[PDB]
Tab-separated table of C-alpha atoms and ligand atoms in Angstrom:
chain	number	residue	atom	x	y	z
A	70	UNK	CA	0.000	0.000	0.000
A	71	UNK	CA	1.240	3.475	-1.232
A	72	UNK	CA	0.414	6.572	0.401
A	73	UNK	CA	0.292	10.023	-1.041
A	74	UNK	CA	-0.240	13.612	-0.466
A	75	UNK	CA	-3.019	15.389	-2.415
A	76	UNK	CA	-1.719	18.235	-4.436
A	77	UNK	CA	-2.246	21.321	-1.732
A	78	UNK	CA	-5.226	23.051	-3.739
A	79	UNK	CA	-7.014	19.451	-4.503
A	80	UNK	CA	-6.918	19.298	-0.832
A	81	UNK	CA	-8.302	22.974	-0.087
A	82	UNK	CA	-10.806	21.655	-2.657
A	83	UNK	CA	-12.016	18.762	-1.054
A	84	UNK	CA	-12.114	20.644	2.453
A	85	UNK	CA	-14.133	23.375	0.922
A	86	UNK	CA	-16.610	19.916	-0.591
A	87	UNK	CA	-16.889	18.898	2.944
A	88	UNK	CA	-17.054	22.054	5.352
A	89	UNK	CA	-19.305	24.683	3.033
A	90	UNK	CA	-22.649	24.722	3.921
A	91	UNK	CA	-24.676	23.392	0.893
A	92	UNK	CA	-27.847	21.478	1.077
A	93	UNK	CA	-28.046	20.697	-2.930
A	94	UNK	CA	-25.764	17.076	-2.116
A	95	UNK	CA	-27.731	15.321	-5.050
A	96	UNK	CA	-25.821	16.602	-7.628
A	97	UNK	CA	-22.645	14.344	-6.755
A	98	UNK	CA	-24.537	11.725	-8.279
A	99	UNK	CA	-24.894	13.642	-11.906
A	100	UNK	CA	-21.628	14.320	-11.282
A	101	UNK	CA	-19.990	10.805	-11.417
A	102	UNK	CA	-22.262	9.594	-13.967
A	103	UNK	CA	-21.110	12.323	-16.256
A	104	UNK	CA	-17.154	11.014	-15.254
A	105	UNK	CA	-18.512	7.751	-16.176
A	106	UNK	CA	-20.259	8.859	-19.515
A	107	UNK	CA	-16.992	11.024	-20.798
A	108	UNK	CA	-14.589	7.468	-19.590
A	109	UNK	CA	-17.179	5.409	-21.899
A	110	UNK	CA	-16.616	8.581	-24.394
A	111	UNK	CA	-12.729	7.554	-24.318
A	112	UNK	CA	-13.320	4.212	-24.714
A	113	UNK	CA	-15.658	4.216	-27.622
A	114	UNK	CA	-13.870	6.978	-29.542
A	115	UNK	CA	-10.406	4.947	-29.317
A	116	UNK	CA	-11.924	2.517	-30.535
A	117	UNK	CA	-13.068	3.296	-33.420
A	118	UNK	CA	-9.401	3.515	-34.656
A	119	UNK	CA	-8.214	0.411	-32.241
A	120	UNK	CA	-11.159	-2.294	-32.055
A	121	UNK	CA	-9.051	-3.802	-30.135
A	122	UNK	CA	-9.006	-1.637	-27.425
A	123	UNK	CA	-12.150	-3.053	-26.818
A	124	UNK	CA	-10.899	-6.985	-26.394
A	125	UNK	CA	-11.476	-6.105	-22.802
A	126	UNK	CA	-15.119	-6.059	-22.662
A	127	UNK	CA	-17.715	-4.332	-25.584
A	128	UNK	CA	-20.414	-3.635	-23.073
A	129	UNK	CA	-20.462	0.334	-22.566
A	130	UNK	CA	-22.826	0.737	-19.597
A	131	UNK	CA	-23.040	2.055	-16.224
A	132	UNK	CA	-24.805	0.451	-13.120
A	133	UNK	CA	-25.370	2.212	-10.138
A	134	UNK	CA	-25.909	-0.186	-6.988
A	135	UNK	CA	-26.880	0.245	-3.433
A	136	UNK	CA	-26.098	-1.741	-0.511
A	137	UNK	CA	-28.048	-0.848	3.112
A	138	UNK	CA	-25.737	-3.058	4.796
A	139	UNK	CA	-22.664	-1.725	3.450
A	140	UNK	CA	-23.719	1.634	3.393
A	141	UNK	CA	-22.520	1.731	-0.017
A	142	UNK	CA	-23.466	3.396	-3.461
A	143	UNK	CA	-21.198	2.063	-5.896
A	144	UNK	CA	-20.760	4.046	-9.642
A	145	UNK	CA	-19.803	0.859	-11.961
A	146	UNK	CA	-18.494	2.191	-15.464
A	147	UNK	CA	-16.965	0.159	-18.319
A	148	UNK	CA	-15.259	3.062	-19.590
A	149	UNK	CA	-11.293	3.069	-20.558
A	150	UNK	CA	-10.332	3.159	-16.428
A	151	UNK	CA	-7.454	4.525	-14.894
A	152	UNK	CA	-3.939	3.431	-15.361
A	153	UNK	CA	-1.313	3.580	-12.203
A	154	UNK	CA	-0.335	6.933	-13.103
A	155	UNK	CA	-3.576	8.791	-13.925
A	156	UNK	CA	-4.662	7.699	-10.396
A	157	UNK	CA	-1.309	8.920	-8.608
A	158	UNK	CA	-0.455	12.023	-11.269
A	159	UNK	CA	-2.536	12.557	-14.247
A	160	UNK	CA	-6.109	13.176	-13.231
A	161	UNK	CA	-4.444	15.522	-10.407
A	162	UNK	CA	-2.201	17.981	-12.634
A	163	UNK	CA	-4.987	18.396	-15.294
A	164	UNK	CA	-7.555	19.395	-12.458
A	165	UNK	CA	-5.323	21.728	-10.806
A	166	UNK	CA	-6.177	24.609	-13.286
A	167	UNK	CA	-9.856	23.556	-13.124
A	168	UNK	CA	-9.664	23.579	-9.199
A	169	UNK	CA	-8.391	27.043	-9.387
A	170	UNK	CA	-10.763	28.322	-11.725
A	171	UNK	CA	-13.964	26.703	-9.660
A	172	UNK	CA	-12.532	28.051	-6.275
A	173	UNK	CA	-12.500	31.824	-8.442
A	174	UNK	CA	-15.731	31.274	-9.759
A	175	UNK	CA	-17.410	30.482	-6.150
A	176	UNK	CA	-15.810	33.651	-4.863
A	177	UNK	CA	-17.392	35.685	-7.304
A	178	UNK	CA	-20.840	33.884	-6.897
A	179	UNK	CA	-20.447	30.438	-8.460
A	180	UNK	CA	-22.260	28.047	-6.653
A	181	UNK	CA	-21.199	24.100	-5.640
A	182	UNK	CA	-23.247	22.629	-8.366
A	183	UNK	CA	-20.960	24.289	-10.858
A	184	UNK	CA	-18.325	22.569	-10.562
A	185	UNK	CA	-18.489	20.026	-13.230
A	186	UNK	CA	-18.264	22.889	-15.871
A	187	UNK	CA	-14.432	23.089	-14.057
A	188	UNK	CA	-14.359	19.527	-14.849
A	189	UNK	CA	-13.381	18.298	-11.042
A	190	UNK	CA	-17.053	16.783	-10.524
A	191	UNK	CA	-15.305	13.428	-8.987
A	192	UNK	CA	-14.906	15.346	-5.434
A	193	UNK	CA	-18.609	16.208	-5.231
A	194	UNK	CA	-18.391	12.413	-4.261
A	195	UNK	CA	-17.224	14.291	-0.863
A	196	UNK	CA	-20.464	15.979	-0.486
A	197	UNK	CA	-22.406	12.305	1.005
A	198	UNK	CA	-19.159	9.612	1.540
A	199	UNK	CA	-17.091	10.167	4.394
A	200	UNK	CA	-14.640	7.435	2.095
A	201	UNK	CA	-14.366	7.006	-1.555
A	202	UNK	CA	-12.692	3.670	-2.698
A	203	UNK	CA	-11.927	3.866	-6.470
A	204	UNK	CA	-11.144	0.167	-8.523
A	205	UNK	CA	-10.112	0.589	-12.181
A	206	UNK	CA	-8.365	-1.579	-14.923
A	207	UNK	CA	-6.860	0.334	-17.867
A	208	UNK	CA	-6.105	-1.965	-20.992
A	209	UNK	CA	-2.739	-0.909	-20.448
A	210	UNK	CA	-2.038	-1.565	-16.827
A	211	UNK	CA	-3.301	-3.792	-13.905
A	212	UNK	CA	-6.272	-3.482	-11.883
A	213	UNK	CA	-5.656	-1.042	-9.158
A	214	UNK	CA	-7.702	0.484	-5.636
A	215	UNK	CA	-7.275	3.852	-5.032
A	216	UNK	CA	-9.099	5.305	-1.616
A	217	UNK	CA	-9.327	8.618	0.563
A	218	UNK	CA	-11.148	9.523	3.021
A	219	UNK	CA	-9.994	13.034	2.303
A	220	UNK	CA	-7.644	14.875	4.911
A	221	UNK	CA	-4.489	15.749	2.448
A	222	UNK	CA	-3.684	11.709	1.298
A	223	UNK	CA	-4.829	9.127	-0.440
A	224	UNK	CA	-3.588	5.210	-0.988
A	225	UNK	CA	-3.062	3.475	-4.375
A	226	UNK	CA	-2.381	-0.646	-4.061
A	227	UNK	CA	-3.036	-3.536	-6.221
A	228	UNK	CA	-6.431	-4.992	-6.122
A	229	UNK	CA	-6.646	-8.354	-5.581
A	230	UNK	CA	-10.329	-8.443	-5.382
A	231	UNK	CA	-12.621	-9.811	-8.635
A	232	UNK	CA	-11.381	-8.576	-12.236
A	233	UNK	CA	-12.970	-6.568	-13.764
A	234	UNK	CA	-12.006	-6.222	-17.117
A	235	UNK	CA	-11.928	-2.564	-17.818
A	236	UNK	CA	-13.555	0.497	-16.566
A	237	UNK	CA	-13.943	2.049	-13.062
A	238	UNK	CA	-15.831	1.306	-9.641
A	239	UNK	CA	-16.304	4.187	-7.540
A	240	UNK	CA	-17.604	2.922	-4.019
A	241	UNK	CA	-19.181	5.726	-1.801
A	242	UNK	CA	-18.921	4.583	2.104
A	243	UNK	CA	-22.108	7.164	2.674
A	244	UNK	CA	-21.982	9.431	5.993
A	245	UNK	CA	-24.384	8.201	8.447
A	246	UNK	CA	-26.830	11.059	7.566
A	247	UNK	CA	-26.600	10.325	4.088
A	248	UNK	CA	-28.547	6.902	3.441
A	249	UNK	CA	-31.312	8.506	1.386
A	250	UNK	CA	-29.380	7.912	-1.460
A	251	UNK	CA	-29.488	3.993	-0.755
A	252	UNK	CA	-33.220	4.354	-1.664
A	253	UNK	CA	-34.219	2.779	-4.915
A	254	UNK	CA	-36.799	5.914	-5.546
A	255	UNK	CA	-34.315	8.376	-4.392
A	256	UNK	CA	-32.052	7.409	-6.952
A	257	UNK	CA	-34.173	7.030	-9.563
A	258	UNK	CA	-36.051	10.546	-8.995
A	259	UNK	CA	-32.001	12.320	-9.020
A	260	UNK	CA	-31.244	10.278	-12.071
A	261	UNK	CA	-34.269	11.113	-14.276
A	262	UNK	CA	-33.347	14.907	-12.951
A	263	UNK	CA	-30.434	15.570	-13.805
A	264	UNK	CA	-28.819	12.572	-16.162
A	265	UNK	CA	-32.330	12.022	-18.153
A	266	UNK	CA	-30.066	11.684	-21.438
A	267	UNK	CA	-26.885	10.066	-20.852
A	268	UNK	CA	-25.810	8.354	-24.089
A	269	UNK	CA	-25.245	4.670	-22.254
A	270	UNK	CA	-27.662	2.347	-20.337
A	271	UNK	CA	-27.816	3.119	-16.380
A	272	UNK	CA	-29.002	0.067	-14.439
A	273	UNK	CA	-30.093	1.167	-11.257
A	274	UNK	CA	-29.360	-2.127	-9.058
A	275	UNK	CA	-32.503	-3.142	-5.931
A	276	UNK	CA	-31.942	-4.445	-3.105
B	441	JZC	O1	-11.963	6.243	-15.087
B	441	JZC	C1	-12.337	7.429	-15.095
B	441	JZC	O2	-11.764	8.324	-15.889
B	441	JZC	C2	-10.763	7.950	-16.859
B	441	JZC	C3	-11.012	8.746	-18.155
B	441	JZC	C4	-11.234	10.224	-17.858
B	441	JZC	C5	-12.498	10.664	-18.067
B	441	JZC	C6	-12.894	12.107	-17.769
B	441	JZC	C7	-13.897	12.144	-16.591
B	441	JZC	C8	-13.223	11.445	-15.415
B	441	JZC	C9	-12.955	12.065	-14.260
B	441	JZC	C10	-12.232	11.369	-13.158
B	441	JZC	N1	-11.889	12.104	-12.149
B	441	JZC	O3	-11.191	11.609	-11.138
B	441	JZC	C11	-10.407	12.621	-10.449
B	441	JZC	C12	-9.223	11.975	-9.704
B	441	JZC	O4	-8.093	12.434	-9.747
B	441	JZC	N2	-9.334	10.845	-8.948
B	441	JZC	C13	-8.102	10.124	-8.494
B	441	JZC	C14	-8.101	8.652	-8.920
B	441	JZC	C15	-9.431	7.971	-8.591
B	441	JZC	C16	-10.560	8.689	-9.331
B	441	JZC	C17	-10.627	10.129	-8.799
B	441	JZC	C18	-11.871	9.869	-13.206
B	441	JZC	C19	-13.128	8.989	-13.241
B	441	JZC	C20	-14.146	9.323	-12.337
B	441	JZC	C21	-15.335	8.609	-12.312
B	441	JZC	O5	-16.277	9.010	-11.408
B	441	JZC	C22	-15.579	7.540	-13.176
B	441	JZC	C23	-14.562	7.159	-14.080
B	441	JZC	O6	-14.775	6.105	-14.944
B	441	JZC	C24	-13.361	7.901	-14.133
C-alpha cells in the first residue's frame, strides 16, 4: 500500500466539498455519472481507430448499486479506467487549473453545483461519503484500488479483489446522515433529474 499527499489546492478543494454549507448534495450523483459517460466517451472513440481496445469487454454501460448493509453506493463504469499513473499524477495535474478556476468562480458567486463545468465533478463524491474507494483496470495496466477519506492523502495498491475487465468502480462509504441515497426511488427521482439523457444504459441495481 502506497500513500500520497493530495496536491495542496485538490486538498483545499475537497475541504471546501466537505465544510461549506450546501444542502443541494444530489448533484454528486450527476456528477460521477457524467465522469462515467466522458470514460465510456474515451473508450468508444479509441476505438473506433483500435477495435481492439475493446478486447477487454464491448459492453459500454453504467450500473449504479446500493447496498443498506454496506452503506454503499457504488458508480460501476466500463469506460477506458485509470492506469497507475492517472490515479497517482494525471487526473491531479490536469484538475489543478480547473480547481483554481472553480474556487475563483465560487468567490465571485459560483455556486457548488458548478463545478463540473471546471471539470473536477469526482470530489462532489465528498459531499455524502465520508470514504471514496476507487477500482479501475486500464487496458494498459493492472487493476488497481485507489481510496481517501480526504484529509491531504490518499492510498493506491493492487487490487486483488474480482477482475474486472476494464472500466472504473467508484464505491461511496455514505456518511451516516446520508442513506437517502441507498433508496431505490431516491435514486431514480435524481437520475431522471439531472442525467435524463446520458448516451449509455444506467441500471439502477434493488436491493
Ligand atoms: O476512469 C475514469 O476516468 C478515466 C477517463 C477520464 C475521463 C474524464 C472524466 C473522469 C474524471 C475522473 N476524475 O477523477 C479525479 C481523480 O483524480 N481521482 C483520483 C483517482 C481515482 C478517481 C478520482 C476519473 C473517473 C471518475 C469517475 O467518477 C468515473 C470514471 O470512470 C473515471
Amino acid at each position: 500500500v502506497e500513500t500520497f499527499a493530495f496536491q495542496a489546492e485538490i486538498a483545499q478543494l475537497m475541504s471546501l466539498i466537505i465544510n461549506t454549507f450546501y444542502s443541494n448534495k444530489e448533484i454528486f450523483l450527476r456528477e460521477l455519472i457524467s465522469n462515467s459517460s466522458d470514460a465510456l466517451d474515451k473508450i468508444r472513440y479509441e476505438s473506433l481507430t483500435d477495435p481492439s481496445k475493446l478486447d477487454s469487454g464491448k459492453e459500454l454501460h453504467i450500473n449504479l448499486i446500493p447496498n443498506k448493509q454496506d452503506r454503499t453506493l457504488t458508480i460501476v463504469d466500463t469506460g477506458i479506467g485509470m492506469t497507475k499513473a492517472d490515479l497517482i499524477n494525471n487526473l491531479g495535474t490536469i484538475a489543478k487549473s480547473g480547481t483554481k478556476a472553480f474556487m475563483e468562480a465560487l468567490q465571485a458567486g459560483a455556486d457548488i453545483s458548478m463545478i463540473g463545468q471546471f471539470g473536477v465533478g469526482f470530489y462532489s463524491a465528498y459531499l455524502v461519503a465520508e470514504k471514496v474507494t476507487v477500482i479501475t483496470k486500464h487496458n494498459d495496466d493492472e487493476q488497481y484500488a485507489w481510496e481517501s477519506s480526504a484529509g491531504g492523502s490518499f492510498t493506491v495498491r493492487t487490487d486483488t479483489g474480482e477482475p474486472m475487465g476494464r472500466g472504473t468502480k467508484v464505491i461511496l462509504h455514505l456518511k451516516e446522515d446520508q442513506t437517502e441515497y441507498l433508496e431505490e426511488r431516491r435514486i431514480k427521482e435524481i437520475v431522471k433529474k439531472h442525467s435524463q439523457f446520458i448516451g449509455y444504459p444506467i441500471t439502477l441495481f434493488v436491493e
